[PDB]
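During the second half of the funding period, the structural biology subgroup turned its attention to how the target accommodates small molecules. The most pressing case was 2'-deoxyadenosine 5'-triphosphate, which had performed well in the primary screen but for which no bound structure existed. We therefore specified the complex as follows and requested a full 3D prediction, including the ligand pose.
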Amino acid sequence: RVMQETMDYHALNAMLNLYDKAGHIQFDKDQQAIDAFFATHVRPHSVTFASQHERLGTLVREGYYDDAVLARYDRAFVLRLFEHAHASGFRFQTFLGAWKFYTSYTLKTFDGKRYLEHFEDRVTMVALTLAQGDETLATQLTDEMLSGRFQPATPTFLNCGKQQRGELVSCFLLRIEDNMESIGRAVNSALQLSKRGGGVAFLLSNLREAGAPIKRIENQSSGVIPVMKMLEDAFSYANQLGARQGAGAVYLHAHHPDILRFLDTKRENADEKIRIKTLSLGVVIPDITFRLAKENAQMALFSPYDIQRRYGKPFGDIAISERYDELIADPHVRKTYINARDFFQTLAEIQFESGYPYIMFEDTVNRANPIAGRINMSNLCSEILQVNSASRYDDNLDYTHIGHDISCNLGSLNIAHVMDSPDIGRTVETAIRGLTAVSDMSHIRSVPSIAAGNAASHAIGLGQMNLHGYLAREGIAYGSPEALDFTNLYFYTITWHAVHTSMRLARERGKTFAGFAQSRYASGDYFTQYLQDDWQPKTAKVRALFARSGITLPTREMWLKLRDDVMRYGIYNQNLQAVPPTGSISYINHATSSIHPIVAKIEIRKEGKTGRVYYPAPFMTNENLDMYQDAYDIGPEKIIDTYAEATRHVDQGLSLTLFFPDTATTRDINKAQIYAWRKGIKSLYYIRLRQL
Amino acid sequence: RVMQETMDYHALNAMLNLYDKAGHIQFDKDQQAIDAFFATHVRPHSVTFASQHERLGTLVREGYYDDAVLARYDRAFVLRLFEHAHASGFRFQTFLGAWKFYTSYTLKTFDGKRYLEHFEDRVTMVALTLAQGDETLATQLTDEMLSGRFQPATPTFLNCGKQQRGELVSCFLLRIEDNMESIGRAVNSALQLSKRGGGVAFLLSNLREAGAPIKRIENQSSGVIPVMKMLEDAFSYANQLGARQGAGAVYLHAHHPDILRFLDTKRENADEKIRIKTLSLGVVIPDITFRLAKENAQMALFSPYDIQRRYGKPFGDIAISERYDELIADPHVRKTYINARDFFQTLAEIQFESGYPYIMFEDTVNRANPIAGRINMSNLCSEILQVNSASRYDDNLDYTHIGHDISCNLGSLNIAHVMDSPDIGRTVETAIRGLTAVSDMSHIRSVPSIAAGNAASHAIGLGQMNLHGYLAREGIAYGSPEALDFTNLYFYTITWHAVHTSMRLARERGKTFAGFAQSRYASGDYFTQYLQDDWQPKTAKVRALFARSGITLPTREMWLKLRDDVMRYGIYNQNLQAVPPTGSISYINHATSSIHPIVAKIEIRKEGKTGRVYYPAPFMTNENLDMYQDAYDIGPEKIIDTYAEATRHVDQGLSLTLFFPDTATTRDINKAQIYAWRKGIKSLYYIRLRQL
Ligand SMILES: Nc1ncnc2c1ncn2[C@H]1C[C@H](O)[C@@H](COP(=O)(O)OP(=O)(O)OP(=O)(O)O)O1
Ligand SMILES: Nc1ncnc2c1ncn2[C@H]1C[C@H](O)[C@@H](COP(=O)(O)OP(=O)(O)OP(=O)(O)O)O1
Ligand SMILES: [Mg+2]
Ligand SMILES: [Mg+2]
């Protein structure tokens, strides 16, 4: 206090990376870094206005905040809230969560020399923004975000309410039809989306294979690679401001003739002009492929060219599994053959050397998918999963028929914090509303097919973070039967409330998502799954928690009751949850990324002027370390295990990474994937091999 | 005859490449190759129908010819012509002109096993096609083409009237505005155009320089290179059917900040990702730049970014020359500086090692340009030169305002053959009509801005071939004062008739090209140039020729008379002539490519199953070899000289190549270019260094 010492919060931070003769960490040194931070850097560079009122005036007047948002409430309420917010007694819990938010989130002055916002402000404008002028909502979003219960996606949190601003949404999925126009559109769409920082993934699977015909003259199509090449260069050119390298991804169906040339753009010892250095790869794999590789058979690759001709649909749209045999019989459909086993072999080697081919288990997916149509691709994070539909052009690239593409608006709940306010239902409801708002205000001008999609589907991505964090606090162990029990039941109870909320919006707004009638929501089967049993706290400790919390587990009475509202009223969103990884927000929200064990006790980031910055995990103390085992230490099985439990309920997907030791073998990898597959998992993200 | 010997017309052809103890060529061995050709390969594989009538029926019925063309005339006339044609007694003059036309032009059966057309047929359908049902026209085009007087562009000759067919036009010029949309459009437009074999050149000059701002935040634009990269990959991907490698070109103004990074994509000892292997480069150079380099000064490169901001126009549109000083004064316009001398130095080294940077003498050009607006770029052959105008987009790439871009439809006259039918005026008129037709029927769907352009401008490219051929026949010598005299007067007389014809169409059709009123055609100055004198056969031999031909040289009476019709009636075409090189047609038409000395006595091509194919030049005999000196032997001056003479009259441009010995020095080159510049030349094509 008064005339204190040690103002190096970077050093203080560092202390978090020392072990005492007894293998304990000085957690407190971190806390000190915070104090020092604010003390020596936050406050002195934070602008302080006479009153809130004068503050906005200024912020509006010099074009920082957007007067358009404020204009939907009576200024006094806009003043009451800024006050509520600042009086809720929020502190940051870590020297980085603070450091993160002020070096990358909080609004600064155009000249970069002064902070103009603090968390509450940010929370506030976000709330105001999404609330769209509905005051009680606005309040609640404020509350939920301040408590730590909710955490909207970065794009949103970062931009809501500012004047100079990006858009509120950031990952995108486009499809490509088999013709020049659709291609030019793709290349274009990439340019436009990327210029504004978006992640875009394209579906290559419909493109005619290398060696296919064009205008009826044999051996002419040149495959997909020269198209990756373009997307590639597009992305590399139209990076976002303040970054080199955009972020693109492509997915190709595994039974597609170019699949090998496809994987081959990643094998380092290669050729030139055939080398893709910044696209992410994803492979879709149907079950048969496993069945094949199992009996060491031959995979048959079918021509999209031919398929289209003979079936009136594009490769990307038919059901390979259900038509494998039929297809091998149709002599009007050319076939090539490769050794499944050698395929998965190739797959794994690449994953080993570069982390990728994302994997999307086509069959598991479509089969659990409550929505009409098939799902043929995924996001750059492999967690979005939704039907899409083809778009058609006029010779001049003008659309003649606008299909539907997928944009994705996410946010997450910090499990811990939710389990802590007995009023779970409110928590879920708000979030859903919040998220839905993101959608409603979204209107991507430059890719008509995306805008159409959103508008039609109102699709959102409610997701979760902090699983480990929680379990740990409650002294349960990642992976444990208890854990499993917990995660199943929780995602169980969350799901009940979101459908319920979406059921509500449906009613409130007089409409539903397009195509609802065809859904499994319309005819009720969606619920069959919840009408049997299984919904009974296996472990004692788990039943416990839920009570010491006041959370009531949805009961057959509730489901049966919910099922009738839907069939009578429908829901507003075509898709509720999705569990992405949780980038740097986590550090702000103080969580453990997503639902997967903690990558380290003291996480280290290559950031800031010191070189690095250390992040101790939530609730962790010298008296509980033994509940913090690395994901590496926990290992694949356990992770694959948790995510499944979450999969019987999540209607989209969950980014799942497997952590392996640097001595793992492709077979090792390969097994894991199999476990994953047999186990229900919808998709697989990355395989990380531990490294420095 | 009856039971003859030696049927190897490839061998016979070869004999053309032997010199006898006295340095004479057996020209006759070639003629024999022809006879053998037809004898052993043409006829036996040429389909012969019972009558013409049954023939079309078939050809229509199996979808070879296009019934739509025939449907505009009474079948009997369509029968009368096929007859006229076949009775005009046309033979080919060379074993390759035949060989060329049947291996690349004449219609064959879908399965490639039989010829279905012969020249006359082809001439005929072309005539029919262009004639658009006007019978006397149709006849004439037939006549002119059969005589050798006219030779429409390859795309046209090749496709007119067929069912399965490409378009009738093939080089294209697009501009790019400084913003993502315009860029995506460019990349797209490239894709679409190229897929159908088009040559496209883009104007890069408006793009913001490497290091310019974006959304107001310093140092961010990444220049033009990543855009060349895209175009590059586009072209490489969407080659035409039966070819690898599309054909793209870019032009950049020499006073543009990226000019050096620009040339640098061609210096072989380079880096990767910055290496452009299939785009053609073109540089625009205004006069000052010479003035600069002369007094070894400093070139100042101005920011397009800034220019736009301060002048409300894009770099690509202002007059650098006229605003050089003004610009260096405006501190609101950033400047970089480079050593002019070192610039031209760089230029030449590249040209030396790779033939390019085309050069377009901005100033000469705009200054001679009779049409409103500036000209800022050129074609992949550097001979088209026309005003263009910016296009504007809506966020979705939909045009909100369609500008004008340039497409180009050419054809040429074989000088010789023209000088041979005293009725020059008919010859010119037809051609113009023929060409105009190409335009009228043209409607490029996929790049709105091109279609708009054409429709507005009706711009055509009448051009010439066989200059050497002629002069030689008449024992004049390439380059000679006589020659010069001849080429000036001829292009002089041709010009009179085309304006006249365009003046006629104007009247016949009740309209003119858009913007005519602003032209120098409207106010008459166009003619001032022809109202003084100069128009008087300097050489005696030249006056001679024109008489022994019956050609009357336009007289001050005619010009004065023509000038009044225009000011009263206007013209239909915004642009009449352009003298491109003459690819493989020449060999068919039997000419010397364009107006520039013959690249060899016996030209050799890497074509056909033998390896090569030998092409002896027109009118050449053992008793006149001394009138056939290589372009290498003639040398730059002389060539630069001829082309000028042609430039006081050609309203667009003339592809000019300089042939140099393999010991020439960049200074050597550099001088030539200067001569060219001081001499009026509008643009410079390639520099060829003799090689094997
Ligand atoms: N000209 C081309 N050059 C390179 N690739 C091409 C070309 N044309 C088509 N492709 C590839 C890209 C698409 O996957 C597919 C279809 O393109 P598209 O324009 O629809 O062809 P098309 O209609 O002319 O031929 P088709 O009759 O075979 O469909 O062909
Ligand atoms: N996001 C980007 N990434 C890479 N290059 C870009 C990006 N945005 C623009 N450029 C370059 C390409 C064009 O030459 C030029 C203008 O693009 P454009 O979309 O018109 O920019 P802008 O309107 O957002 O910014 P400005 O306000 O500076 O014009 O900027
Ligand atoms: Mg097609
Ligand atoms: Mg702009």
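Two results from this model are relevant to the next phase. The two ends of chain A are 39 Å apart (CA to CA). DSSP finds 29 helices and 17 strands in chain A.
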